[model samples]
Target: HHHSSGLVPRGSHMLEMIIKPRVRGFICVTAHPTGCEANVKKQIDYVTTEGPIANGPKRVLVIGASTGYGLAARITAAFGCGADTLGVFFERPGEEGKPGTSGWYNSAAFHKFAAQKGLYAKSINGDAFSDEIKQLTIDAIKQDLGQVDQVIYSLASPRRTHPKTGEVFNSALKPIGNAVNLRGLDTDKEVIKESVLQPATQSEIDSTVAVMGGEDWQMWIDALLDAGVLAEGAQTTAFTYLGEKITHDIYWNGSIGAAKKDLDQKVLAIRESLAAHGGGDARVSVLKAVVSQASSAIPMMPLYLSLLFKVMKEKGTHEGCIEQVYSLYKDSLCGDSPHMDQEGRLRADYKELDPEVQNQVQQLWDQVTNDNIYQLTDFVGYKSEFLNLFGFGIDGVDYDADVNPDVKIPNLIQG
Candidate 1:
């Protein structure tokens, strides 16, 4: 039921909170509209102050463009790259006296700001893995922007339903071969602890790949190419992550690791598929791993990131999602050619992977414990950032004042 009640008293004694962080385990179920809007504005302000990107695409599309790197990329596209953008993501609206998810509020603020800047901003809210949504996107694309010059794919979901086959594949987070004991963050307890992660089965491996792989990416490209909505010399990029030894078991060599590897399984074909359309480009960007709504679920990431953040911040090279994606969008993809390894993929995590920084982080890892977690790692910062995702821990937002939770996204195609 939609609570139209006005002026809800913001107190812990109240039965229902007007706005608060309802955290459970590693996830915060509730979101703050004002905080989300403020966060969006903060990111936009950063991009605007950085100035425009040279030789950037004018019309762009971002799949999974609501939170984390996708949202950052969308900000860069509109503000930095001066692109008219269409975002596709799955997010629920605010209703039933509760606030919406972070992504929902993010797109809402994004549309408002994009329009004020005179940029064409439209969004499709549905499963991008489905054929119906894909068809609707093509139709939507035909409406305003006939063709998009850039497509940024940055989806990171735990499960995916195949469009052709009626099968649901859920991704697993576990090591591949043996159970390894690693120091990880117990979010609920707010302490560092050691946990054992069992290896994934063959079925889990295949399922992880299916859910997180490049099949859907390839499918999207094929549909756009067939529809002739992709502009000549168009560029499409999907995000990837490859951590060092610290997270090898829970991330790099884990179940999601295979899924990430599977994402690259279609890079060549996708590159070639877009290669002929006036020399289209497809390259995967290896982004830095930070604390995000998605990354929070991965074991060892919280503990690992807490240490990494402090070290990088000390080195004055710390970058959150926004800064890193800004580099990818402006400095690398638009302004100049980014250096790549033997695989022909962009390496954008040099700061995170620097030898001195990693050494400092590992040294902290050796001493981090529940008693010394705060001193050893940026545990407080990690928690604050996690709350920031749901718009709770923002400085400028008034959490005490009553604000309407039911907010709408303008020009949202919910079909």
Candidate 2:
């Protein structure tokens, strides 16, 4: 079921939420409008308070810009770095009285809030990896923005239908070469069943890798270059994550690992492709694992995130997806040239992967029992962050207030 706005399954909360009136069997048909505004306000509030990054992009293009790290990238590029942006994402908007996807709601929220501040922001809602979407974006660039100084490629999907062959490629999360058993997060019995209880097949791995991996990145660069839409000296960045030893096989080296490895390989091409254009450059920022829509879906990641959050927070560096993206926009990819921290990494992980932090989580993991899962995970923090991602849990928003996900953003810059 897709949710557009207001309180729908932030992380694993779906099971706990009182199922609102179901329409067409077990699906949400209504959304809260005030909740959508509240969601937008919270993000805008973050960008305002988080010290703006230095010399960030003034004209940006973000493919897959609606939620997760991509939306955060859009907000940071536009609000924090003083950029005007063009965002492309596959999203669903409310049609008639029915709600759309959260990505659509998030995009609407972004465009709505951005216009009030006199910032230029708009979006293209379509399948970003397709030739049609690419052509539309390229044409939009030619007519409206003129040039794009930066591109942020952050797209995630469980499946992708190849345009030519019509074959459906589905993604899986598991180790490539062996049977594996490991600990998982979610004290609740139900969430774990959806996560760690299953194993994957060879077909699942291959299809998952093909759908979620590197091909699209290379294609995007080729399209942008061919269209002459990229600005000179432009830089682009994509998101990836690597976990500690316990969850590494399930994440950094699993079926998803095949996808991420493809992402890593694209980094070299990003560099070559952009550099070949005379002045642009591209790179992928590998993040520390945390709780996200995408991250939580992976097997054994919730346990990894729960433990990691507990340790990182005590160290004062724990970041949710938004916080991580905020730091990345403020410090790393939003700038003219990608910068690195003392570790020679992008320093965008918000220090979540710090040696001491990981060490503490590792130590704490040994002692955490199923009975004390909530305490060890400080699950309150985990749950709060998860809900806030979709604008579910925030202050000053009346949950009971009537909200319409179909509301239009005013003053869009159309050309």
Candidate 3:
């Protein structure tokens, strides 16, 4: 049965719904299922064509494995590394009449692709911060894959509820020391303006860390160890970012930065815990900034990405999520002795953090203005990538073709 809510067939396209991209602030209100499938296929194709990881994880568990970094990690693990994956995320499923979240449709496409290749893939859609979801994931791992060799923590959210305390904490993106005034791009309005961010209060700072920090990551690791589900020599890594000093007050040294600092400090404690539980490893991976749904929401990040993309693309060093994850697995995590930076943290931001590239971005940032944003930066590329995140602007997807938004993820059995 077809339902027409805000859809109308245009001339010569009777079977298709005239789908327009709807947005509320930085979030897209609607998703294209076919386009989402195409996006997943594109990533899978990239990883498949790139060849296999020499020595990668066999069984991997990815928490927050639906979109952005998490989804890229899942694709790299399964398609590039030939790993069986179990993913846990919080996403809405498509019902008989309504469309689900982009992550839901993306996961549906993923499970179908994995099954066609005889690869084991399953997902749980629920609050990963809750104790119930943790237990459910543990049970599923034990029943199906037995043990997982790698765990990737890539959860990003604005808020989290404490499982034990029933307290809700929301993360803030304000500066830590003083009010910061910077030029930011309003992607929705297609304009650049000055964005002023006030310093966060002590209470807000603590709350931000509580929501985005490493407490939940530590909990998951402890639970997995107690359940005896981690395979020998297993390793876990959480994704982080340390961008150039320009946006440090709003990002690297902001409220989010405090949370990340806490998360970074937890690496040692987690590593010790993992070491005690037979042989395992835990560390943080400082990733390159990209045009993600999460990053696009940050006030000044879009402008930074616009400039950074121009430099990186011109120099032939730009990498999307799939390329980044594949490199992380292939160049860093695939071998017995993993490579590390001087500080012992994993490094996947080599190209983005290059000295020459940083110099160029800094130069561009100094002179970038709304009138010359297009000339001075890659705002076009930034906007295009942002649309791609919501399954729009995909190359081969015929948006005019009739499609169903009620696609099902075969492996998702729970809400």
Candidate 4:
């Protein structure tokens, strides 16, 4: 009976031979390690081809450096600038019988590639919000790196335990003052359905702010400076998104938006502290909408991204996490002339929010429905990209071959 279903013989580990993606709604429960490595390798290949930055940082630290923009930024720093890297992330590692999360495999792949090129890439796995992890990172820097020239904070998680208050805060996704009826793609049903999202109460809004805001980022900076582990004139950045007016109610003016605002508001204070400490600096980078776990959970974002992908692809300005990070460094961060908006924040989403592109997205948004979802938008690209996050549907990855999910990150700082 098992033979009829195409199950193969056991290997070193007893997992199913062909580990196809077991997706549930927007979340893929299983990820392939080889596929994750392949995805990371491609990013390496791209950056290696593009070459290096002239005045890039020689030492870098990436908080939340395992997935999405965080992982991409690490790739750029290591392969592009040949920077020594220290990564801090909370990820599930593969066990005897269980598979690691995509991020864990991604981290494993990163350490492997870094070793191959003889670059120093170390990582700490723990609650980045806690004082203990901060202390551990400080020790790691003192022990190995001596000092870090650049710090990139790209953390995205739903829950946090406030280190000082000892309170557990969970973020919410809803409009600030009013409930909104929005139509977006229901990934499980493959339909364009209208969903009503309730407004966030003041309590919920505060919780979201506490969990997703700049407090942890500020804490890390303080600890690094206190320990004298940050290099002179160090630069730090955190990623934010100021989307177009189309999904403004659900995205820009929502609880998550409140958290993002909290992030930017504290940037001034953080910047001032960094400035006082050896002429360092801090700023928020506004990134474009891409298919990500965080974005998919928003009520009306999937539909908007599907349409945006179609429009951006047509105009040849579409970018995923890696593409966005590569250009962000090459053009904005490392370039002679950095483009700054009125608020001093870096704008990396220019092409995504171009008026002409918005015109096309809005036009397509009006015309999209369940029947014409695929034809009207780039759902195929969106879906495939989403799958790629879980290490599925990537080119040159053999999903049919047997692979051991029990892999390890080379330089993981074990507790």
Our model 1 lands, by Cα RMSD against the true structure, at 3.7
Name the candidate, 3 or 4, with the larger lDDT value: 4
Q: Give candidate 4 regions above 4 Å deviation.
A: 1-16
| Model 3: worst 10 consecutive residues (lDDT sum) | 11-20
lDDT (Cα, 0-100) at 134 in candidate 3: 93
Best by TM-score: 4
- How well is each residue in 1-415 modelled by candidate 1, as lDDT tens digits? 2476655655533433478888897888889988999999999999889888889899999999999999999999899978999999999998647778899999999999998999889999999999999999999888889999999998989999999989999999889898878777787877667777789999999999998888899999999999999998999999999878787777878899888887777888989988899998998889998889899888788888888888888899987888888888766687566768678888788888899988888878868875667877788888988899988878877788777777888799996
Model 3, 204-260: lDDT tens per residue? Answer: 999989988999999999898889999878999999998877878888899999999
**lDDT at residue 54 of model 3 (Cα atoms):** 85
Quote each prediction's TM-score.
0.95, 0.85, 0.94, 0.96
**Model 2: number of clashes?**
3
Per-residue CA lDDT of model 2 for 318-407, tens digit only, reads: 665567777776656655455664423465664766778778777776566556577667666766556655556667876654454555
Name the lDDT value of residue 360 in candidate 3: 92
Model 4: lDDT equals 0.87
Q: Order the numbered candidates by TM-score, best leading.
A: 4, 1, 3, 2
Poorest stretch of ten by lDDT in candidate 1: 8-17
Candidate 4: 10-residue stretch with minimal lDDT? 9-18
Model 4 vs. true fold: TM: 0.96
